[PDB]
Specification:
The structure is a homotetramer.
Chain A (H helix, E strand, L loop, with lengths): L5 E5 L2 H4 L12 H5 L22 H11 L3 E5 L2 H4 L9 H16 L3 E7 L5 H4 L9 H16 L5 E6 L1 H11 L10 H23 L5 E7 L3 E2 L5 H11 L12 H9 L19 H7 L5 E5 L4 E2 L26 H13 L3 E6 L16 H19 L4 E7 L18 E4 L4 E4 L1 H11 L6
Parallel strand pairs in A: 1-2, 1-10, 2-3, 3-4, 4-5, 5-7, 6-8, 7-9, 9-10
Antiparallel strand pairs in A: 11-12
Organism (chains C, D): uncultured bacterium
EC number (chains C, D): 3.2.1.21
Keywords (chains C, D): Glycosidase, Hydrolase
Amino acid sequence: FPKDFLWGTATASYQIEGAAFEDGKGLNIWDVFSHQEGKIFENHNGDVACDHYNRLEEDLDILSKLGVKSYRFSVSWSRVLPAGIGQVNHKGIAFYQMLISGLRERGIIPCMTLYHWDLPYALHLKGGWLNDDSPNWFAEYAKVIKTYFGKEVSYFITFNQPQVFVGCGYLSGNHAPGYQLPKAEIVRIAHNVLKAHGLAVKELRKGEPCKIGFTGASCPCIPASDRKEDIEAAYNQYFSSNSNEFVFTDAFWFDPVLKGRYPKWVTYINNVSMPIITKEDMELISQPIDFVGLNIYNGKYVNEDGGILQKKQGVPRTAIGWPITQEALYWGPRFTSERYHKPIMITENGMSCHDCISLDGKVHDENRIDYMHRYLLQLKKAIADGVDVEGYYAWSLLDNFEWANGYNDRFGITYVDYETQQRIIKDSGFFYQQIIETNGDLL
Amino acid sequence: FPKDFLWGTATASYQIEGAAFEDGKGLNIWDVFSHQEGKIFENHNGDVACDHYNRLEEDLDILSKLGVKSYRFSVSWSRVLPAGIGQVNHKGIAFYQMLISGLRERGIIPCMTLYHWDLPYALHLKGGWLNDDSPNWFAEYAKVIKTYFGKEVSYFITFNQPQVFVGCGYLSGNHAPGYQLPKAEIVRIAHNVLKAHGLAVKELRKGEPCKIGFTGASCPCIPASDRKEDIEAAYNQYFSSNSNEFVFTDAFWFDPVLKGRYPKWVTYINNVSMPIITKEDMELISQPIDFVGLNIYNGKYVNEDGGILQKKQGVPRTAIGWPITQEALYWGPRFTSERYHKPIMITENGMSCHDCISLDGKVHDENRIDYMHRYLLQLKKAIADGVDVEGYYAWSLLDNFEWANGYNDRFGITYVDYETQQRIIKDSGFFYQQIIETNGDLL
Amino acid sequence: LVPRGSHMGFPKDFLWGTATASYQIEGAAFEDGKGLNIWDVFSHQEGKIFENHNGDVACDHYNRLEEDLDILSKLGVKSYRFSVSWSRVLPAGIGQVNHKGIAFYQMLISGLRERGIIPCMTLYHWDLPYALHLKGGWLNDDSPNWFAEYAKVIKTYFGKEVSYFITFNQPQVFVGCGYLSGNHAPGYQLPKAEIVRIAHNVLKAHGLAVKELRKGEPCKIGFTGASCPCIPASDRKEDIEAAYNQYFSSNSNEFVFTDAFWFDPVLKGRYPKWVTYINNVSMPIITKEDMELISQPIDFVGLNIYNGKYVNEDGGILQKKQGVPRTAIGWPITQEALYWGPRFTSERYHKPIMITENGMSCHDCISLDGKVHDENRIDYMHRYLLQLKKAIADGVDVEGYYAWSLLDNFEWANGYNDRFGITYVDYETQQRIIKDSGFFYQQIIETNGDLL
Amino acid sequence: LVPRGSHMGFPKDFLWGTATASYQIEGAAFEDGKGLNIWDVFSHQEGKIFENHNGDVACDHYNRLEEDLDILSKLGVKSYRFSVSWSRVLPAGIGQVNHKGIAFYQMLISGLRERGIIPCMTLYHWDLPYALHLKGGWLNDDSPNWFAEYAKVIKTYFGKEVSYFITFNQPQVFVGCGYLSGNHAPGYQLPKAEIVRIAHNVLKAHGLAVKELRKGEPCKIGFTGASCPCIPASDRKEDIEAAYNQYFSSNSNEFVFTDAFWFDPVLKGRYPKWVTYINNVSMPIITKEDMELISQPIDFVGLNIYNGKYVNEDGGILQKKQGVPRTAIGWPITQEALYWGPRFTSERYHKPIMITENGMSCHDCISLDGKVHDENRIDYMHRYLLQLKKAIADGVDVEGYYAWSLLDNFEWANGYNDRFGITYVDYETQQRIIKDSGFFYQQIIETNGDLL
């Protein structure tokens, strides 16, 4: 691993902060969605979550104790702009200022996600990402971000996982705001998000220099073998998309951002209400960017011909049900490097485990250690084969609100007892600490 | 029946007009919704419908031939304001001008519905009835209506059946735009629609004098007997509503419009994102109105205690599946008269039949004749017992696009062969003609 | 097909009929020692039937036999198609005969003979005795022997007076809806291999039943299929061939509702080709002796036709026309179905055809004038019979036509929400009112369809 | 209950066991004349099982008997609980015994005796012979006689060497999931009256099986229930009473998954009161002779306990705590269930209890070090056994505890996605790796639980 390699841990505003209805914070779509009967596992919500808004100091101390180089967090748009535009809320700004000072004080590099799915409710009432002005709303947010944090923060990510907040939010309907919209409206929302990204980059370039990223949800295709043919088939499957399956793919989002073009098929869709995609739109979307964010939890194995192989019977898996596929943190970085020739940051990687406090009062998560050890060995091999990887962020610092699954999935290197809000560092946290101290030399 | 009694027939823009993408007409939510896979019976849509935009003269001639006193139609908001606000489309205005001249020329009183569910798509993209400004959008529409039609049209209905376009549009999701929103969002939309109504009334009062109505979907409770006790129980059931069942009720919509108050329970709901309902809102909503529109197709029988009785085994029914309950056109008018002390117009009454062209080349609909005869006898009895009823509009002039059921339900007194667009007046049309000629004396 | 001549019209001996089924009309479900059937239990299960309707009472025809026979006489009907309740005559489905049950059908058959009406007896119209269901129903190896025992009791007690038998009504529906889709009793959704097992047991049951019905008095025996005829795009030889091929097609993923899957075994002594190649877990062993038992000689093919589907030049199903004339149950009106169905079935099997059911669900009510006006049913009947007449003209041997139904009745999972009757039934009073269609049909019978 | 005091701990003769079931481990589904069972057919139906998994091969334990017996020896297990495949020893479920089938279980039982391991034989762990399903399965009046014939064959061929029998494993699940919810074979959703009929036929089957198992060698006979114990809000007499009452409650709308519905008939010779008042169509006739047959004397009550539910002072079920410790199958970890379940069952029936199943699904894998580390399973086992120990201390007679399971295996509708084993199985190679939990359990057995 490089000497400057960003050894990180990651969170998101709604998943940890709590204090949902305090200090003039505006409603977001997850406040409303999570309160709707039957949207969340056992009607869990992020009203309180890890109460991190009120326990900032303790969590910064855990970050210091683990020896984490970088902290990836999201800003609550609705906390800093309660109506999403206009009046800034300084109590909101103050929280993130106090966070960023805490980080600088401890020599931890801030990595700021602008959008981790908590759209201000006031903007949702105006049609959210269906609204022609939604890119301008986001630009205004991005300008406020640079204004108040541009001095101290030099790492920005515009959007976390558009695949999920657009796919699950507006196509499948299992995430806020919980819609199932026609293809034309999905493409309209995707285009408004990508243009929002363009305007946000422009805003973030005004003043202090910084590194700006775009984070994709990625399920890398793992080749059947090292044979050139099998590798090519995996590459092709990985970057494929069509009118009936695009919103969850890499190419549909990354080609516009990095190559300034949508996949071929997008030009041929003539559905009623399809948005007008102009050359100026594509030039706005494809602003120069410093790194590609990859959120990789697992991949899929493909045959010689790039067909997806049946998951092996009894494949090692996680508490959320996903398979453990170590090679995903090799092939995902590699193929993304080959396609876009950009520095890669693993902005999320981690595992849901059925964690508990043992009789000895500790949290033993050997499955998470093995997952982390296996995946980091593969990331190491990718760096060895010439993939430029600038860092790796463990999802997550804390067990937290896992969206439609509520608190039923624990991704943390730190356990949270929700009765007391007690943090207990898991074996995985101490294991990760050793990796950072040794810059991954002993994996 | 009174000498001035408005013997009418009714239509709606999207159900008959066609010409969906012509003469600068803007998209509406039904253009987009009806083109979504699986939203409509056999993917029917109103692209062409009865092609009434292009066959206006023939349909006016059928109106004349039947001897209809009044014609109830809706204006396509998206035809006269393609983006829903700003630029008026005069080709759109011209169509309705030509309709209204055709009506005046034939001595037929125009009854103009402003909103029959075809929300401009541009406003939907801005959040539709969730948007704070949606009442102002509607006011702007209502002002354009009065401006261009206030001279010739003296009968206006702001909203047709908010129960259905809000309930089916945004709660059950079977109507455009096809959402299933939490209670708080339904109340927000209801409040925005009722305020829209207030602003629209104010707009329609500026200039020529006119009669303005509000039309409710009504399923009247029919008492077990003429006993005072049973009648009281039916009245109470009819005007009941609660937090878990309100959007399809009469009182939830009519109390705000006519009494300037929501039902008691509404004040006590504190759900996340609930709108703030102010005394000024309630005063805006409760503008003075000239008649109550009732769309009555059937009612429900209630026991002595106002509990809804199981439908009788083999109850006479219609091709859409609804029961035939003749007394509904007595008790609905009567209870609405008793509660609000306002003139009533039956703005819709009619029956879906499995109509076809017989071997003799005619359309025989005796079931529709019997339905109409039975229901009008009950309306006559209501007038006799002192209910002020100013008119009755047969739904519909033409077989048409019956929303999520497409063309599978025929409500017309005129048959439409969709292969040729040929109109054939049904036996019911000639029966209705005789009723109008005889002012219902021979029922 | 060789034309017969257009002049002749309907034959002079043509069986002008009306049809019913036991569970749909009889009521008296728990009386005179009658055993439970699968529809008694299924219809009492929450949410199985429209508004939890059941056939406990139905048209109370068990108790109003005389009035209904008088309506049959008044209409001048040549033949009456009815089903025997297996569970009424054999309450446990085998062993002890119930003579109170036998007595009812004796009294019916005497009433018919007395009025010069030819009885047409359906043995099985879906009301499997519950005692046999508890023994696995049509999954049981012995189910064909249970049915044989039933068919023997039928011939024993009714063979003297009844000379027209139908073993099974619409196996497509009682097997497809009963055991694949699960919307009919007993309401199962079984794998393909179990559907084939049940189909095979039903077809063997049919074989044994034919053998039983041949012992003693001579009779005409039929097998009734649910048929949705493919209507060709045009009269072009190519389009007709494509429709014929689509109509008689079947495969492992779509067979239970087809004609060929049921009729090839009965009439040709073979299943479609694909059946021999299926090796699914639990597949039944289909032997040459099974196929010979199934293919007993039969006198007519019963067709229950309500509508068909229009197919393109290549036999692909065409989109239904926008606003196509339809019925109260939602089905389209497709008059040519009662031409092409009889014709293709005649061409394939070279057998006499009886239209064992044809009719229309209408939203019927008692008008202010106290009558039931069903012009839509008249037009449906007139249009369909014109097409049947044309089929006879083009050389299809058609021995009769049974209007579904004599009475409005219990329409299975739809309960009393669908009225198929030429006679209206008010379920509050059990009053019968003959509809306009009944008087229209009377005129057709009187004139042997000469004026259609 | 009279206390023993905490010092003594587990009895000296305490049966430290591990458990399996035939279909979940054996494989060899279509070999050595083995008949089809309902799980062979159900698991081959599209979409019935997670990723269309099936038990065709499972852990291939039929072919790897010796290796698994060696793991049993190495762990030092006192008792092995396994099920006999009915369809392996009687391919048509009755009549012709299959000696190749008998031979397998003979070789198993010899392997066990040879290693000083006490066999605990489950007759029925859900694999109903398919031939009997075709005859209506547990709906058939004769189903108890089919089971008696099976139980007679069991005693005949294994009565010499096996002195521990369990008639039925978890009727709650094979009846509830098999015939009410429909997520288990045969996958039906039957009315209440059919569920009661099946329950009654199963309980009578149990009666006849006990009678059969008493003929010849002396033996201990059990009945195993699926139990979700109610855990009281506190130690207050009133909160404990409310939990006891909730735990043993049942009514017409919620009975099939309860303890009392199954155990009252078996142990007290009566159904809950409400059963006598149900008059649903097709309800079976429950006679005093039926109840006397069902309530044959038995030696122990089997409890399969994985977790319980927390109840308030009034016995109402409390909302599960936010982030409650849970397992890979999604169930909560509720340690006190293995106290309160044994205790309340002891108080109600005054019978010896065996924990016939207890264990945890974990997301287990082979670590980089080539071992399987399952500390969550160790903690689960340690916590639950501490609670069982406390129950023994407070005077509950507990004769043994069987860890579910010896091997990771086919977890029914979840396929191989849930690993319950103290031994890991790589399904690609069929390699067994003993997990940390296996070595932890070995130490507990060696020390008779003295160090818990």
